[PDB]
Design an enzyme around this catalytic site. Structure first.
Site, PDB file in Angstrom:
ATOM      1  N   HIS A 124       5.677   1.819 -13.487  1.00 28.04           N
ATOM      2  CA  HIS A 124       4.405   1.610 -12.791  1.00 28.04           C
ATOM      3  C   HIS A 124       3.250   1.060 -13.635  1.00 28.04           C
ATOM      4  CE1 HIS A 124       5.270   3.092  -8.726  1.00 28.04           C
ATOM      5  NE2 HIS A 124       6.137   3.893  -9.318  1.00 28.04           N
TER       6      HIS A 124
ATOM      7  N   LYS B 221      -3.920  -3.785   1.306  1.00 25.12           N
ATOM      8  CA  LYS B 221      -4.606  -3.125   2.423  1.00 25.12           C
ATOM      9  C   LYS B 221      -5.803  -3.942   2.922  1.00 25.12           C
ATOM     10  CE  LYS B 221      -3.528   1.331   0.164  1.00 25.12           C
ATOM     11  NZ  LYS B 221      -4.157   2.537  -0.471  1.00 25.12           N
TER      12      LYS B 221
END
Ligand code: AZZ
Ligand code: AZZ
Lengths: 813, 813
Positions: free
Chosen positions: A354, A657
């Site tokens: 990540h 988003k």
């Protein structure tokens, strides 16, 4: 009211109303005379929950009969947010519940605000897990999320005198209607002890036992009648624990502290013993559960077929102990030989990286593992030895490669590199965006890629269009559905059809209308809930994400001050009005991040009260940023700030988003921004600043911040203002730490991107002056956001890592 | 099956079955394929619970409309046991549930065994509270039980190598279906801080806050549709508690430890700070709740009517802080003058004394109160000063009376006598049996009785005939009901009608048959659950109660050994066979009590394995004695041992339970034994030993145990056996502590009652040889046990203390 929210059938509305009344009476033990809105929320939650259970029981029954390969997603974080509206959406119940509650004289939206966020994550990594669960259920995969049921999730952030204060997130106080305790499936977890060697191999003895009690939460697929399980473990002391008498009972807390609180660090490794206990706790209980389920299957003793029936996905290195724990169980308990056990382990496990930031990498001191997990250390040493023998044979004489690749790091304190363990013990390693995955192969895991190139993959992150469009932006979902139907909700690539409406005057007007309504609704929310007044005609300029140096909220601050100074210099000149909103939490021990928050509020204090500015510029710090707040602010945004130094943000998901919800993006060529720009076309993005290659060139030369200060008068003025106490009159030296960092030890080259950023911001303002062309560009963004659905991401994991096929087929109701 | 268990109507059975299936599916999230017996128990519990809620809501609504005087029963202990069967009995649901479960293919009795005891008490005092709640609901009183929801109740007792081991009673592990959390009515409780004086009187400042969260449990009356509330408080930390970050969250345990565990001391004062916190915690939250309810009434600001609407019963001195806490609230917060506040306090409060043993009396160090509750100490000093001014005026010049009556005890450490506080601040003080109440007026509270004779009352204890006859002995309840009907269950005096059946051959046969069946059922229980074999034709000789020196389990031990030695001396002589069962828990820190348990098992080890003895004598230690075990052993008993030294057992209640269930009683003239013997006639009791007056005569002379040892050869032999290691071959001196205590420091004069006890036991054995005459005496006991119903006891409290009238009238269904 609106199409996408399902049918409100006479039969259904009547049935919902009576079940609501039943729960209020029998479940909550209340009548309408004494009930509070909280009681009404709970009666609704229980009513909706009832619709899940039948599907939940038959989904799990189906998996038992069909016996498909099972996917186990291991994560220390599941950032779930609220569950009520999400459940209604996926069950096609929203309009019916809206109608049923309206008829009972209640506003459903008011009741929805009562639910606590399940804040069991820090940010991107935890929220990805949540999106992944939704997509896996929607794609008909036999998947289970496994984690820890923290009693306290991410802290609630209060702002006091401009400073962040933390308070306990007591999210379980009023109870959680969604979970089901399963005390019958409690499992023991072992800690400490010592290793004993016998004729029958090694034995781990004299351990302390902590019990792991599972709590199951339903995960509904989108309108497919699939309901998967998220199983979260809670720590319990055994009944003979420490068993003067009173103290022994009180000391049970020691054991149960394991599941008490989420570590509130985002992209930062803290080497605390409690954290290690949490990591082993989830891994040990989960693996026992996995093996139990495997032995009790319709198929099968024979662990050769284990990788055919089981996949374990490691979300970062946090559950990396799954690798030596699986070896421990197979070798010590099942009596498989090492080579066979290892083959099974590698074929079972896969690892997702990540970040590349060195401070986030888990490197556990050997002395910690030695005390806590003595058998796992022995197994890790053995893994290391056999792995390095492979390196030595492939690259004879390359002694520095050996030291670089070792799972054991030498030095002052010996440490275990958990990332190296993960690569060695997994058949697949992936980054989370194309650029990040390439950086892994070129830089930090170069040696491992040279040894095993086949292991390395990319799986670009995604977000669920259920939560992140339908749920939070019903107005936009609806106008889209009018034109192209409802199929895009589980097939987001269909949004491309919207490209043929970019010149459609009706559609342009509707897109812009939905945004204005969202902006008005959010502007009202701010006044009601926080008593802050904003102009809804201004450009909503928003940066929401965890507070970090790498995410460069400070670069944003510099731009804000530049605008303020320009207005003060030429007050009677026209400027495009802006509301600049910045939000996010700082880790409690992260001093610089806490200083940055204080700076943002301090700028607001000066800017928001200067009469010469008027309502042309407003700076607001968005308090307690979390999933439920994201669902409110993201649909209201015009401009999305994604301004991390190139090469630092592995992917980002906030970016996606905003793209889906009708905001334009200003950002660097970093993480997924690169793929977003590629999808929409660079003309439809506001890209600025150094590329990865430019950062590397600056590093070789040596970054000198003074150079920029010397040659940019506007930047110089801001630094003088900060230093002299312009933004802190009572405490003139308040921001000396920030100035010193910027001038002398800035790892993230804020000054180096300042000029291009400010100029790019001018191009944004110019476009916003032309509403029609702004909106046409917006349409081009929304229309090409399909790639960034987590359904695509999960389909790629399924096919290329887990070896399973996604299915859109409905289970019977 | 049997009449007293209600109707099994077609409509009801059908409705119960479907609701059972609904709960299994929707509540437990299970189907019949995966459900365990525990799941079936919970589905049943939830089904029965549903029948309570309607009655619960309307009972509380009724009290709001009618606004009767409310009774608040304050206790740190509520020894509730299991709730399922009790609820069915009081709702007339037992046969219907039995039928419904039978038809689903389940045995209800098997499911009943799955419920955990609510073991929130130590023994007599806690169990009295439980019986009282049942009777108050049955008599239609607006009553509330207030206490603490301990996470861990009385420990589970395991016997290992003959020694008691304690383990945590994790009674909430699987959840408690009976309670309803009421987080909305959470109240703050204050600790520590300091007192500040202003123009507007005193102020308690700088305190730590602990939150009190209530949990409500329904208390159903017997078939009258009344459902009262037991409200138990749980300790919660506030959300800003200690708010590095992680430790602050973990430290929340400190606050929440208040409600973690019940102090496992029976009739013993331990002056620990945590215990004081528990005592104030229950008192402070309860009084706020009481006052809130008072202000929000249909009647009323005006506290003159407070005692007309509120009664507070203090169960022992444990909640004695109610007195200065009420003063604190009225004076400091409501601004009433002292004299008026005091008048209200006295008229509101009443105090029940439970023992005369000096080691049980609460005497808190002043330095503890000074730190923890600085304002309460000031109030206590002021109460003391004004009280002693009254003593001085009534008895001028009597300076020793002043020191004797003072609430403040002088010495090494200054202490507060909580019993003295209670008498001063209550309008009524009662003992718990006639003899005990007389001893209070004659000895320990003589001075207070001389000052305020009107204050002193008797309220002889009782037990509920619902739990202690109908529930645990349905066979006996039924044969009684055949003859005299069912009215006696809520009017136990009707059992007198049974006197006209003492010569009835059919009834004699039925009484004896019910006992034999009970004995067979218990004998089977012992083999199944504990693998121990007993002869059901033997006399069941049982002593069950907490292990204490005053209760004289040791005297019982001496008799057992006497029988063994007599058999060994004349093996071929006939003796009436006996199973001697002794059971009870020792407080963990009570060494002598733990030695006594070890002795009992050690005797069993020798006696149970001597081939010459055969099945003529068996000694069994009943493990983990608790309410649910009491319900099993009491119906099976022939002989009830109530053998405390005269003047030490205030009342006892176990004695009454045995009388009601067809056992004959061997006992001293102590506690309620005196009233029991008076009711049945002394001819129908086996009374032996010193009376109170004889004990006093021995104390004046000086108790010399050597005298008895010198003059009783049989006693001498037992002491030699104990000393020489006859009962502990591997560890010959194991019982030296016991012998030393008996010979030199025996406060309870075991030797002094030995001869008469052994002789009285011979009279018991002789009667048991004649089954018809044994059973006729039994009938005479059962028939006169009516006075000892807690319905009588509570009716007396209601009329003579609380000033309210009991009602048998049904509320509508
Ligand atoms: C808690 C926390 C601290 N820090 C601090 C630790 C480091 N202290 N030093 N040296 C500093 C630089 O990484 O930031 C961080 O970067 N992120 C965090 O989340
Ligand atoms: C825990 C406990 C101890 N004891 C001990 C304390 C006393 N120790 N001294 N002296 C002894 C005599 O009361 O018994 C008791 O009587 N009852 C109890 O419950």
């Amino acid at each position: 009211q609106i199409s996408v929210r399902g049918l409100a059938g006479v039969e259904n509305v009547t049935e919902l109303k009576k079940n609501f009344n039943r729960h209020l009476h029998f479940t909550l033990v209340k009548d309408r005379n004494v009930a509070t809105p909280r009681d009404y929320y709970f009666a609704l939650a229980h009513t909706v929950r009832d619709h899940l259970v039948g599907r939940w029981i038959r989904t799990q029954q189906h998996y038992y009969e069909k016996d498909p390969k099972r996917i186990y997603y291991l994560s220390l974080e599941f950032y779930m947010g609220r569950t009520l509206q999400n459940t209604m959406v996926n069950l096609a119940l929203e309009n019916a519940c809206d109608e049923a509650t309206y008829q009972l004289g209640l506003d459903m939206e008011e009741l929805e605000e009562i639910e606590e966020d399940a804040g069991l994550g820090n940010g991107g990594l935890g929220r990805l897990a949540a999106c992944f669960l939704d997509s896996m259920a929607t794609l008909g995969l036999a998947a289970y999320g496994y984690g820890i049921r923290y009693e306290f999730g991410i802290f609630n952030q209060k702002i006091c005198g401009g400073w962040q204060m933390e308070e306990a997130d007591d999210w379980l106080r009023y109870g959680n209607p969604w979970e089901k305790a399963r005390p019958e499936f409690t499992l023991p977890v072992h800690f400490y002890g010592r290793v004993e060697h016998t004729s029958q191999g090694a034995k781990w003895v004299d351990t302390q036992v902590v019990l792991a009690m599972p709590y199951d939460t339903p995960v509904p697929g989108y309108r497919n009648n699939v309901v998967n399980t998220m199983r979260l473990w809670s720590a319990k002391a055994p009944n003979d624990f420490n068993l003067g008498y009173i103290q022994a009972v009180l000391d049970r807390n020691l054991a149960e502290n394991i599941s008490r609180v989420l570590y509130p660090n985002d992209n930062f490794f803290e080497g605390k013993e409690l954290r290690l206990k949490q990591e082993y706790f989830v891994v040990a209980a989960t693996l026992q559960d996995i093996i139990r389920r495997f032995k009790s299957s319709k198929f099968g003793t024979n662990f050769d077929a284990f990788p055919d029936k089981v996949a374990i996905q490691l979300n970062d290195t946090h559950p990396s102990l799954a690798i030596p724990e699986l070896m421990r169980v197979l070798v010590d308990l099942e009596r498989l030989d090492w080579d066979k056990a290892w083959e099974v382990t590698v074929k079972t496990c896969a690892y997702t990286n990540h970040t590349v930031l060195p401070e986030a990498l888990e490197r556990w001191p050997v002395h910690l593992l030695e005390t806590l997990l003595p058998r796992h250390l022995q197994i890790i040493y053995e893994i290391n030895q056999r792995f390095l023998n492979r390196v030595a044979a492939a690259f004879p004489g390359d002694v520095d490669r050996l030291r670089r690749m070792s799972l054991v790091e030498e030095g002052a304190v010996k440490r275990i590199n958990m990332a190296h363990l993960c690569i060695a013990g997994s058949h697949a390693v992936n980054g989370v965006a194309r650029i990040h995955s390439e950086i892994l192969k070129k830089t930090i895991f170069k040696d491992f890629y040279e040894l095993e190139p086949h292991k390395f993959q990319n799986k670009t992150n995604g977000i669920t269009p259920r939560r992140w469009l339908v749920l939070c932006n019903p107005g936009l979902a609806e106008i889209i559905a009018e034109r192209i139907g409802e199929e895009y909700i589980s097939d987001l690539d269909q949004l491309r059809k919207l490209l043929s409406y970019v010149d459609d005057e009706a559609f342009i007007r509707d897109v812009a209308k939905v945004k204005q309504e969202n902006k008005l609704k959010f502007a009202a929310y701010l006044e009601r809930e926080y008593k802050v007044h904003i102009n809804p005609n201004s450009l909503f300029d928003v940066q929401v994400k965890r507070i970090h140096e790498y995410k460069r909220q400070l670069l944003n601050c510099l731009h804000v001050i530049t605008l303020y100074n320009r207005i003060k210099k030429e007050p009677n000149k026209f400027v495009v009005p802006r509301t600049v909103m910045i939000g996010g939490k700082a880790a409690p021990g992260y001093h610089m991040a806490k200083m940055i928050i204080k700076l943002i509020t301090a700028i607001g204090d000066v800017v928001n009260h200067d009469p010469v500015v008027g309502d042309r510029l407003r700076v607001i710090f968005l308090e307690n940023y979390r999933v439920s707040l994201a669902e409110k602010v993201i649909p209201a945004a015009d401009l999305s700030e994604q301004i991390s130094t190139a090469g630092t943000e592995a992917s980002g998901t906030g970016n996606m988003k905003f793209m889906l919800n009708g905001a334009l993006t200003i950002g660097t060529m970093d993480g997924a921004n690169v793929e977003m720009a590629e999808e929409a076309g660079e003309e439809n993005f506001f890209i600025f600043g150094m590329r990865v290659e430019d950062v590397d060139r600056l590093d070789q030369r040596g970054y000198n911040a003074q150079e920029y200060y010397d040659r940019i008068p506007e930047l110089r003025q801001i630094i003088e203002q900060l230093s002299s106490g312009f933004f802190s009159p009572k405490q003139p030296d308040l921001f000396k730490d920030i100035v010193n960092m910027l001038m002398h030890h800035d790892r993230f080259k804020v000054f180096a991107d300042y000029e291009e950023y400010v100029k790019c911001q001018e191009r944004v303002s110019a476009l916003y002056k032309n509403p029609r062309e702004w909106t046409r560009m917006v349409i081009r963004n929304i229309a090409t956001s399909g790639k960034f659905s987590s359904d695509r991401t999960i389909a790629q994991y399924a096919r290329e890592i887990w070896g399973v096929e996604p299915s859109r087929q409905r289970l019977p109701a």
